[PDB]
Subunit: 331 residues, 4 copies
């Protein structure tokens, strides 16, 4: 049994609990956030995007019990003050968005935790892993690691397949992304000074920056410095699409590209020929779902520009990858 | 030339500035918030609901200039620390949502301001004004006042007209309300513990509490304790509807009720027979817009239940009412 | 083993199919619509509100196979031309919205069908059933019956409980309703000339008329002519709320009313004290979900006004009620 | 100049809004499938473009706008309309069903002198993007096309790019507001598109567009050099055209932004403000280049260039349409 704590019971943290609660390999001992147990339990029970929790929840003072299993609730904003050493937690899932670095997240280790998995990009001085792309880099000795971004978990398998089959010279990624909690409800100042994430999330197409493409080198070293891109946040509650426009080493046809993708398909990376829309990927277990209906190739003179697209649920896809990586790290 | 400050450059503060900036009676000296001048200027220039500002904005350091007039910007979370005295500010529009009480809002007076107008309900010990309903209660000597809530400004003229013409013994109010910034973007803990405002604003029907009906007595004393109600927040960016289901002292007809409403119509209280929808009231100047097409009467054993509905833009309707009450207060 | 055809593979039809593949008592022989099998199969596999279908779907010329069982696809706009006798269908689920009457829906019988369940109000010359309110009236002699409206399936159990415990003299219903396929995507002319459903569905609060309250007289005869109401369509994809403001024959308390509701709770009528929002009822099997957090009472001069509310998934709640009524009709 | 409108839809009603205070045209008639009460109500109130600034009165079979009367008809077949009896000078074909010379010429048979089609209508006629190729107009044209909204956004941007640096090839992606050809909720679709069948306001909906492939009709040098697709997202109006392209010359972000600013005109605007989609609702530009979204990535000696332009797919296109209308009749 592996003792896990969750710091930051948000979209990712709560969905992580949903994925770990039924699997006997883990024991979620505690959850830390900024609120009381009643609030945490209600948010776990009811979800506007992922549906009702299938199980039973009851709340007790300073704790709540899910499926008969009790979980201590704490409210410490400073991780070094947490009781990880006292409950002897094995791994902390750092899901707050505030401690995404080796320096900052290591406060969990000083608090007594043996290992930490960060739910975001956390710099380049620690292992960053996209499951079924580079999880082989783990040997079990790593105290703090990053599960990368949702967008890298969508893009990496696609870019790796393209590079391995045809060699990818370069490309531009644009992700049409569901809005998230870092955007305002209505136009208002933003905490980090972003004048676009300041705007009403569900009423706008909101251009935004993302480093997923520039940082791919941390996951696929061969592609370091070969991709860039940005995002457009749009008014869907969850569900996103990654488009990649690129040039390859070899002339290709749509059929050849789609076949390479199907051949690279696994549990993390899926393949579909159905003309789906975003609402159809909510809650999927794949980290990436390649959409063969969106493959397009244009040729001028002898040079090809290739466009590919893969769906992902920035919540469920990422969290499933995060739990795959958590299982690998503790094995 | 009245020296105004705005504390909290939010939805209401920015729309207040929009309504005062063309207006010669006010000079807006300062704005206080929690961010820098470039952010306030950007948010004033571009609006997701109220459209782009028609005018020119330039950003200096620590201030910005609107249509050639400079406004100093400050970022002090504690109002008592504000430089209202040194700027000789006459009225502060308290629009943050954090000082809506006599005691808390009086810190502006301690900061050196002469008067404070609060843009929300602020308790029972202060004058609360819905313009063109009870604004005669103002005499000019009041240092702090409340402009009431958006729902109170929509409901009050409707309930006053019904009471005056037919006697309103009791009623229930329901406001189908646009979501606001006190609701979360996606499901998440909520600062004030509301498990319903914690849910994703633009994805849900969210029942919520409101004191607009219970507190109507502060605006229409004859109606103290005769109304109650609640809200349903729904996914529109702005624009709202107040429904009132009530019993009256007098049998009435649809035509009678509608005529009573039109007869009470003014700049604050409007009347329409067009089958409009919420997006059509965005930016209107009325504090309340009675919809004669929604009037319904049901009679059982000779006893009637009456349903009426009035539209409002919870932002522009309220802000226009607030500037009306401000002008009246400083013209006194 | 009862052979069922579905006419109109829409929101109600497709969800009916989702619920009947579970039940071995039915076999769905055919589906009729205005399009091909590829599209019907695709729309059945993927749903923006009710999620992906968990099961297997394959497409065949003029048919598609679900969980290994084949279903015939037809595209005849006129029901009299259907092959119901050839297929010997026992019951047709009439879900198009165009044949909602005894006279029009009897064309299914002329095509050779034994019985018709209309998924909408179909007039007062028919048996209209809200399961677990008046389904005891069914005896097997009925060629055509109506499953009533979604809103009546939400309101009836609540109104019945109120009437049974305390006597319901009169009441006004207001439903806060998800938008539907009879509203336009963007502002445009409307097929029925309604200037409000002509407006952009996902951008507005849209007042609308409904007979759900008046039609309660067909399901609860004691309450004939005692209720009326209206609707407000709001930008959620599915999930709705029914509010009721009413007067009773007896004085009551909030907890007394809530206790009566919990007591009347069953498979069709659910009871909750959780402060839920609309997205939380998507896909529920109840026809009505009474929300104890919304009960309120107003007392003035000793006469009370009572406000209660029930949630419903206007799609799944109604469809589950519809399948319950269909099983009841074919069991007799 | 006697202007009539066939199809009082999103484009038609906004066109009338723009022509009310233009002293050179007077609108004489409007044809649609509904009565004057509905048309007047839809002209008065609009969910995206706000209330009409003016007074509307509805007479018998006509309505008066700001004192000026306009008769209304209900003919689904354009050949049966009384353009001859009304001596119409130019008809705006805005239904979406007669987008071809052969079909739109029925206006000519009813007695219409000139027809401007508010959509792409084939290669047999002049298709014009104002301030891109409008000088091709002389007096002699009875039928012309105003192109698509997406072409009116892309064309000036692509032209500036070609003229300054030479566009080898490019892939366009437009993040587009949903439109009335998408379903409100999931349901069969009349043209069989399984994606436009899905609920418009709940999904990211990939869609095809010919705006890129057809650019050759507006900029002949670029025939067969661009392609692209669309993504429909839940905003009521407002759209963004992103272009990923390769150029003949090596460039810098500053060079591209300067070349765009140099091309600035009433049709093609320039901004460095970090705006969002709702900020372009109702703008008078056919295209608004966004300098904040320019990106260049370089691998070996080869560059990929990304640029983006906003447009209000309704107001931008309609403003362009009436500009082309004025030009067409000046001659
Ligand atoms: N949401 C996504 O789509 C997504 C996808 C991939 C990665 N991530 C990453 O996951 C992390 C969490 O994101 P989220 O979407 O779940 O956001 P969220 O806002 O939903 O979750 C944040 C939670 O952390 C809690 N928290 C904040 N400060 C805290 C502190 N000092 N101590 C304890 N708890 C605290 C908050 O109260 C909130 O409950 C972020 O770094 C995000 O970048 C998010
Ligand atoms: N939005 C409506 O529909 C509406 C209608 C009528 C009244 N009101 C009331 O107006 C008030 C403001 O609401 P809003 O909708 O504009 O909300 P908002 O969140 O958009 O505005 C809040 C603003 O106040 C600022 N702020 C917070 N604390 C501050 C402090 N200590 N000092 C300076 N600035 C601070 C924030 O940075 C933000 O700019 C609330 O009390 C609300 O109840 C709102
Ligand atoms: N959706 C709800 O919330 C709800 C609730 C209760 C009752 N109902 C009732 O159910 C009925 C269907 O509604 P819906 O929401 O599923 O609408 P919908 O528009 O999704 O379904 C209509 C379907 O019927 C098909 N159709 C139309 N005419 C036809 C014909 N002549 N022959 C064969 N097929 C035809 C259409 O192609 C479409 O697929 C309506 O009467 C509605 O009022 C709907
Ligand atoms: N909406 C945009 O963003 C946009 C941009 C550029 C071009 N267009 C083009 O403009 C045209 C109209 O699009 P829209 O957005 O106005 O759609 P819309 O659905 O709002 O307008 C269609 C109108 O035409 C009427 N109509 C349909 N058939 C008719 C007939 N036979 N006779 C007379 N009237 C008829 C309908 O009643 C409706 O009022 C389309 O061809 C579209 O491609 C649209």
């Amino acid at each position: 049994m592996v003792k896990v704590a969750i710091n930051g019971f948000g979209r990712i943290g709560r969905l992580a609990l949903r994925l770990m609660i039924d699997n006997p390999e883990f024991e979620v001992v505690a959850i830390n956030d900024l609120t009381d147990a009643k609030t945490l339990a209600h948010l776990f029970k009811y979800d506007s995007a992922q549906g009702r929790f299938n199980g039973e929840i009851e709340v007790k003072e300073g704790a709540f019990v899910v499926n008969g299993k009790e979980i201590k609730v704490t409210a410490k904003s400073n991780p070094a003050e947490l009781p990880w050493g006292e409950l002897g937690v094995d791994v902390v899932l750092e899901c707050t968005g505030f401690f995404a670095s080796k320096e900052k997240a290591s406060a969990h280790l000083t608090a007594g935790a043996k290992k930490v998995v960060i739910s975001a990009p956390a710099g380049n001085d620690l292992p960053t892993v996209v499951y079924n792309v580079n999880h082989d880099i783990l040997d079990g000795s790593e105290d703090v690691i990053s599960g990368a971004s949702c967008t890298t978990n969508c893009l990496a398998p696609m870019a790796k397949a393209l590079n391995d089959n045809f060699g990818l010279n370069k490309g531009f990624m644009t992700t049409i992304h569901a809005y998230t909690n870092d955007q305002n409800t209505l136009d208002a100042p933003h905490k980090k000074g972003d004048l676009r994430r300041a705007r009403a999330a569900a009423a706008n197409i909101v251009p935004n920056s993302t480093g997923a493409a520039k940082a791919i080198g941390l996951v696929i070293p061969e592609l370091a410095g070969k991709l860039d891109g940005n995002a457009q946040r749009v008014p869907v509650i969850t569900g996103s699409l990654t488009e990649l426009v690129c040039t390859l080493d070899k002339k290709v046809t749509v059929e050849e590209v789609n076949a390479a993708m199907k051949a690279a398909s696994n549990e993390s990376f899926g393949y579909t020929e159905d003309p789906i829309v975003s609402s159809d990927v909510i809650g999927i277990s794949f980290g990436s779902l390649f959409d063969a209906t969106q493959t397009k190739i244009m040729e001028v003179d002898g040079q090809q520009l290739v466009k590919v697209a893969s769906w992902y649920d920035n919540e469920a896809s990422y969290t499933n990858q995060l739990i795959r990586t958590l299982k690998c790290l503790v094995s």
